[PDB]
């Protein structure tokens, strides 16, 4: 009965573990010890955007490296111009609970979805000079946790009922569904070539999916708590994961095993978001201890800290070209750091 | 030094900000409450009595507006579903005191909400429902407390309370026993930041709004006294 299947699965897992152990040859730190240190890094704030009346939960730069989108719980969605700290559009919301936002690569659509189990799409380039809703996507049984754009007609969504879906805006119905997670998922990432994407769940696991075929390809498990944020390496062959155990981990797609870990004996607080720079030497990571941090990607040695906030940080981002970073927190004050 | 096409944008931004502040001013007037309960509990019954995605209700008493939120889900793990709520003034909690089988597990549930890391500055209001069923069960004598709880026999009825002891000493005995059980966990590690208000209610009661109003007033008064250093 199920005993034979369990025995076969155990044998396969043992064989896979043996193969992974045999594949390992040397540690990355020993190879990279010869690299010179980058040295101390100092950054200072240049502008301080303000105007919100509640806590902040999301942020996403555009493709022009000048406009950004901010979402709160007060029921308003704001579009900011970074150069002159001006405002362009303010949009009301039907539901007062919002946890995600997204900004289209073309620049003509904005997607938003919170706790109402419904996603909404807003259009900006219309006559009569006002913003109005275009389409509502429904059909989920759990709160939305992330949404991203592939094009102007395809959107990927990750819900709290252990599901990921690919939609069709014009048609209005799903065309694919991804299953295989035990617990709820709380992250999503997209590849530069838009053919692969990964996800993170609360059962301390990571899965690599495939849009063209529609089934999982690889699974990784090295954590012991929830996974809060994921990031995808610019080259397209590495991961970046953060958990609640105050550790940051980098996975290798080709070797199917870990390579390095980032952890300090002093910090015990949680991790909320991670991001990369353009070149890849730096690694920016938020924290629950009222500050941020920057790590060396090759030495696992701390480089610098970013302080000045009055509460926990909720999101951060790096612009496309690599000019400046942006951070948001629960004190209602978004900040831009150079 | 700046062209007119930038002055117009600045004027637009100022006019947007003014209306934003004016619209955001109105939000502070109302009050908010979250409702948490389990199955077999008459949540909808008291909701309908007070009335006359996420279900939301609103009611007005003495020129004061209250919003009440409840969420329908079967995850059984709270997670970020509670991480959002950090500003509500109270968390209404309702249980069932008729079914002797489940109380123990219900107790464990309470502990979680009493010890959640995010909810360290939130006061809990506790309701006990289905008094008549308990009265009939204790009158019939089919079920005994000693079968499920063996500290009942050694306990003695506290004196100098006597709210309405006309029915029987046994009903007050059970009532105060259950009240003490629920209050003990709350008082174990209160530290004075947040406290609990027990109550007794039935299916046909109609004075719940007044009690909610009084407890909300007490909570606001206690917050203000701590704010102005007097305590």
């Amino acid at each position: 009965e199920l005993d034979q299947l369990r025995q076969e699965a155990e044998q396969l897992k043992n064989q896979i573990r043996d193969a992974r152990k045999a594949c390992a040859d040397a540690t990355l730190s020993q190879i990279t010890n010869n690299i010179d240190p980058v040295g101390r890094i100092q950054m200072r704030t240049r502008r301080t955007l303000r105007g919100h009346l509640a806590k902040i939960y999301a942020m996403h730069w555009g493709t022009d490296s000048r406009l950004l989108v901010s979402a709160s719980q007060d029921g308003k969605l704001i579009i900011w111009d970074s150069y002159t700290t001006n405002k362009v559009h303010a949009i009301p919301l039907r539901s007062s609970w919002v946890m995600t936002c997204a900004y289209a690569p073309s620049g003509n659509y904005v997607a938003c979805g919170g706790l109402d189990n419904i996603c909404s799409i807003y259009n900006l380039k219309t006559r009569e000079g006002n913003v109005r809703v275009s389409r509502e996507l429904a059909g989920h049984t759990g709160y939305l946790s992330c949404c991203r754009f592939l094009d102007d007609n395809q959107i990927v969504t990750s819900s709290g009922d252990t599901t990921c879906a690919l939609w069709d805006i014009e048609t209005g119905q799903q065309t694919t569904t991804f299953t295989g997670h035990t617990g709820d998922v709380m992250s999503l990432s997209l590849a530069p070539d838009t053919r692969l994407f990964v996800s993170g769940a609360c059962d301390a696991s990571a899965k690599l999916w495939d849009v063209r075929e529609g089934m999982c390809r690889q699974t990784f498990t090295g954590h012991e708590s929830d996974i809060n944020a994921i990031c995808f390496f610019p080259n397209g062959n590495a991961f970046a994961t953060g958990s609640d155990d105050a550790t940051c981990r980098l996975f290798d797609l080709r070797a199917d095993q870990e390579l390095m870990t980032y952890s300090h004996d002093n910090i015990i607080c949680g991790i909320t978001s991670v991001s990369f720079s353009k070149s890849g030497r730096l690694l920016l990571a938020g924290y629950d201890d009222f500050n941020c941090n920057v790590w060396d990607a090759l030495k696992a040695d701390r480089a610098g800290v970013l302080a000045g906030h009055d509460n926990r940080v909720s999101c951060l981002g790096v612009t496309d070209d690599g000019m400046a970073v942006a951070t948001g927190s629960w004190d209602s004050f978004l900040k831009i750091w150079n | 030094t700046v062209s007119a096409e930038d002055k117009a944008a600045a004027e637009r931004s100022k006019m947007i900000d003014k209306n934003l502040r004016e619209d955001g001013e109105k939000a502070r007037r109302t009050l908010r409450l979250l409702l948490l309960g389990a199955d077999n509990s008459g949540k909808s019954t008291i909701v309908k009595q007070m009335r006359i995605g996420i279900f939301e209700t609103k009611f007005q008493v003495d020129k004061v507006n209250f919003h009440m939120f409840d969420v329908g889900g079967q995850r059984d793990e709270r997670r970020k579903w509670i991480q959002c709520f950090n500003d509500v003034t109270a968390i209404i909690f309702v249980v069932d005191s008729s079914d002797y089988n489940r109380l123990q597990e219900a107790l464990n549930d309470f502990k979680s909400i009493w010890n959640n890391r995010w909810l360290r500055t939130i006061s809990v209001i506790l309701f006990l429902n289905k008094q008549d069923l308990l009265a009939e069960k204790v009158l019939a004598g089919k079920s005994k407390i000693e079968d499920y709880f063996p500290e009942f026999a050694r306990y003695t009825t506290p004196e100098d309370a006597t709210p309405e002891p006309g029915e029987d000493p046994r009903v007050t005995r059970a009532k105060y026993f259950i009240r003490k059980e629920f209050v003990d966990i709350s008082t174990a590690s209160g530290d004075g930041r947040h406290i609990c208000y027990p109550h007794f209610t039935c299916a046909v009661d109609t004075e719940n709004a007044r009690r909610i109003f009084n407890d909300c007033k007490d909570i606001i008064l206690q917050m203000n006294l701590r704010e102005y250093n007097l305590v």
Partner: single-chain antibody
Amino acid sequence: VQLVESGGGLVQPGGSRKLSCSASGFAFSSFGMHWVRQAPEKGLEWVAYISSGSGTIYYADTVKGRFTISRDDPKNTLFLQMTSLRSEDTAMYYCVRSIYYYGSSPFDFWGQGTTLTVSSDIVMTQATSSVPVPGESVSISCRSSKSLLHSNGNTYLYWFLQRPGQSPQLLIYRMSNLASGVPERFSGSGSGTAFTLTISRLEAEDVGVYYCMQHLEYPLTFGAGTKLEL
């Protein structure tokens, strides 16, 4: 989107009248408003400008003191009081709309206008008075008295077309951006104080008068214009 204007009558000098305009089909409280007039046998000329919220009002230097513009939001109406009639104020009147933010396209829609028959500043030049003229490419160049460029990096210049017996339109804004709902054959480029517009694969329904306009500073001034005769 619809704009309709009313008024206009022959009055001896010394009188005063009102000209009204109403909008239907779009939000009115957001946009600003302008007024333009054209002589029977001359080019266009600027008159007055009112912003949104009535924060600022700009008048032409030649007609200050005897004109008063105003608007009503609940009724969606823009109307002008004009007094002290002279013999040089007999012309046709047009009204337009515009909105200013990062990436907008001002001077978008032109409504109808009404006729009236009574009883330093930057100057820009156009060379050719007219050109007689399928399938060829035509280049029209006009020059400014001052360089049209600012520290931000944007050059302010607009191109307008007028067909016979029709209201003007918008073709090119900010010297390099194509407007909506037009064929892709048109193009424009140039450098400081020398701006050219090139049209390729010429066809029918392209005959009219072309104007190059500046918007760097008030007052706004048009050009002489050039025609194309088949």
